[PDB]
Structure 1
């Protein structure tokens, strides 16, 4: 009754091949869609109306493509996103995608002006083009300046050198974009999928976010329904491990931007359920390093705990997003509802599959234990309204023990009433 749904029969299988044989097109997905959708802003997606429609449809991250358009053009894109968000809470992160050393018909002086404009306007993420080695990342971090230290740097792997030197690059980036457009020209088209699966693999091991990009629903630029290769490509990117999936032409210039967003939402939700966690969790667990970080250790005990009871959600209190990021690397079925006072952490955490941020805006309660419990209550009332939690559900609550500890090192099992 509960168990027919969200591919639970396939999830119980004892081998991967039996998992595949048990996938069922009548097992409806239950869980909130968790792979986040990045939408490139362009003429088709600049109106505030259009941007609200694309938020109801699932966009979590707006991409600004600095290959086209002036600073004033993009400042207007930024303005319409922020006005769409605050004319409804679903935060939307803003991502600056550097022109990079691009020819059209190292770090340039233009990229550096663009990165400074980005800090000026408070962007949350930089998609850094043509990262070929760790010093390219530093060049970017420098450019951002001490004022842009909270901005995440997702490094775009677009050519052979970046693929070769990937471990070094991942070791200094917050995350990765598999930038398949340039990559499929710079290395042979038939080899991209190997590079994609590898980098998503290595990123899932590292606990850092990975983005699949470019041409996933290409044909919806002119048609209202995608091709079968495209829906496959979305589904497989999620099955591969990706934290984010992206739309470029489909939302920037095409005729069906909202439908494009909706379609990635639909494919993503089905594929999330078809994930074979039992094998996935076991492989992450075996390969990941023993840890003496109380937050890592609470994270994995909390995720384990969530699977044993089919927890509806893990509610985590986080300030920077790190605690939710460590839950998310284990790919819980349960929603990671991350309550934070940082509105920029709330936006950035959309880079991590499965994290649903709540922005909490009350002044601190005099007694810290009362504050913690007030934020947790926020978490639960929100999750009830938004359909995450039903009375009678179990939830795992992850929090800290004392204030300014830096550690979210307490886990509690709890029944929604």
Structure 2
């Protein structure tokens, strides 16, 4: 069975219980709610439909709330009509939100546009369609020279490569969306356009104020500032979402692949979950099969070591959502099965024990590593070494059981209680057999914390089923 986890964006085509059950069967592990669209009633029934399928089937899944985030956009044009911009012309942005645009000027939504930009900077409009160079900044105007021909429509995204943008961490609507996330008890929040550590702290504080302190934060890295501050962002976050498409608009194209590989490797080492996202199987919005190129990108992303891969429009609104999940699962299984363990700063007890446990499992052809865990840390510490064995993670914590669904190669199981180390061994052997993942005579390695506070893994034990 595959080890890499699949995040599916769920939308109108895929939100029914019937469709969700088929998506789970096909390999979906996590539902993404994209809050760039839909209202609270719609997202609420989506959440309930998934939870209904879970309780009826006993299948497990996690729920991830992806925020819209703050943004810079252009605004309206005369008559609603596109205008044609020409290489070499002068073009001006104004922060006066009342201005209606034309072929010479358009308003932007961001009051700080003049402050943050500098003469010589690049302005990109509409997913990089039209590039411009700032030639002067005067009052509420950023005056530019257009670099290539293109048609400007209304309400288009603006990207400022290499610029530290003083947008707030959270749009006002994002703040209400997070409260909804707390009300609904989602498992993860993916926070958009994270640029610096203080952005993460603000999200953490907002969740804490509404009872969401146990919701894990996945920071979306989308531009050069976020990459520059990656280490501090990761330290403050519970995980990372690699937004390849945004990066390709914002940094030199030849760097994007190494930004992805670096972020995945650092997440692995930090024992934090990483999702790779955008431009995965986009061709399947319209087509029943992906391209060779897309399949190869997915496979290489898995070989890079990602915990999870994410479907966007393909699973939410496209014509072939089940086919997209299925072929994604096929690629995952085919790629996961040729990956090997990775068995490589003063040494901490948890890492010594977990690395040794994986080494022992490999030396003894153990099909399963059973881990006792409260918050998920010990399960993620074992996964760091990419064990051949499946990780059966026993927890009494319902939130942890859902969150571990996102971690590569982990099968979480909720248990009523674990009263002692020896009880853990007895129970874990029972559930190992019940799971069908191991059989009489198989070796299992069992990892837990004994006589220590939650958050430290210190014991490894070898049992025959």
Aligned to 2:116: none
Which blocks of at least 5 consecutive residues in structure 2 are unaligned?
74-154, 157-167
Distance in 2 (CA, whole Å) between partners of 1:368 and 1:185 is: 53
State whether residues 317 and 375 of structure 1, in contact with CA within 8 Å, keep that contact through their aligned partners in structure 2. Answer: no
- Higher deviation after alignment, 233-242 or 404-413: 404-413
Please give the residue correspondences for 1:67-78 in structure 2 after superposition, counting only pairs within 5 Å: 67-78=36-47
State whether residues 17 and 50 of structure 2, in contact with CA within 8 Å, keep that contact through their aligned partners in structure 1. Answer: yes
Distance in 1 (CA, whole Å) between partners of 2:57 and 2:399 is: 19
Aligned to 2:173: 110
Secondary structure of 2:337 counterpart: helix
1:190 is displaced (CA, Å) by 4.5
State whether residues 95 and 124 of structure 1, in contact with CA within 8 Å, keep that contact through their aligned partners in structure 2. Answer: yes
**Could you tell me which of 324, 327, 339 is aligned with 1:260?**
324
Aligned to 1:129: 192
Aligned to 1:156: 220
Aligned to 2:100: none
Distance in 1 (CA, whole Å) between partners of 2:278 and 2:264 is: 15
- Cα deviation 1:154-193 (Å, max 9, x = unaligned): 1000111111211121121111100122222223444321
Please give the residue correspondences for 1:247-326 in structure 2 after superposition, counting only pairs within 5 Å: 247-277=311-341, 280-281=342-343, 285=344, 289-293=345-349, 295-326=350-381
State whether residues 421 and 448 of structure 2, in contact with CA within 8 Å, keep that contact through their aligned partners in structure 1. Answer: no
Aligned to 2:429: 377
Report the TM-score, using the length of structure 1 for normalisation.
Answer: 0.84
1:228 aligns with 2:292: yes
Which blocks of at least 5 consecutive residues in structure 1 are unaligned?
1-31
Say which one has the larger Rg: 2
- Cα deviation 1:334-374 (Å, max 9, x = unaligned): 1011011112101111232111111123xx47x63564244
State whether residues 433 and 439 of structure 2, in contact with CA within 8 Å, keep that contact through their aligned partners in structure 1. Answer: no
Secondary structure of 1:332 counterpart: coil
Distance in 2 (CA, whole Å) between partners of 1:85 and 1:405 is: 28
Aligned to 1:185: 249
Secondary structure of 1:69 counterpart: coil
Distance in 1 (CA, whole Å) between partners of 2:353 and 2:69 is: 40
1:324 is displaced (CA, Å) by 0.4
Q: 1:408 to 1:69 in 2, by over 3 A?
A: same
How many residue pairs are counted as aligned between the two chains?
370
1:276 is displaced (CA, Å) by 4.2
1:290 is displaced (CA, Å) by 3.1
Secondary structure of 1:182 counterpart: helix
Distance in 1 (CA, whole Å) between partners of 2:464 and 2:328 is: 33
Secondary structure of 2:57 counterpart: coil
1:410 aligns with 2:462: no
State whether residues 316 and 337 of structure 1, in contact with CA within 8 Å, keep that contact through their aligned partners in structure 2. Answer: yes
Secondary structure of 2:56 counterpart: coil
**Could you tell me which of 323, 338, 355 is aligned with 2:393?**
338
State whether residues 271 and 377 of structure 2, in contact with CA within 8 Å, keep that contact through their aligned partners in structure 1. Answer: no
State whether residues 339 and 375 of structure 1, in contact with CA within 8 Å, keep that contact through their aligned partners in structure 2. Answer: no
Report the TM-score, using the length of structure 2 for normalisation.
Answer: 0.76
How large is the Cα RMSD of the aligned pairs?
1.9
Aligned to 1:329: 384
Distance in 2 (CA, whole Å) between partners of 1:163 and 1:369 is: 42
1:405 is displaced (CA, Å) by 6.2
State whether residues 96 and 127 of structure 1, in contact with CA within 8 Å, keep that contact through their aligned partners in structure 2. Answer: yes
1:38 aligns with 2:101: no
**Greater strand content:** 2
1:145 aligns with 2:208: yes
Please give the residue correspondences for 1:166-177 in structure 2 after superposition, counting only pairs within 5 Å: 166-177=230-241
- Cα deviation 1:228-271 (Å, max 9, x = unaligned): 01111111000011111000011001122122112121111121
Aligned to 1:393: 442
Distance in 2 (CA, whole Å) between partners of 1:321 and 1:334 is: 17
Distance in 1 (CA, whole Å) between partners of 2:44 and 2:448 is: 38
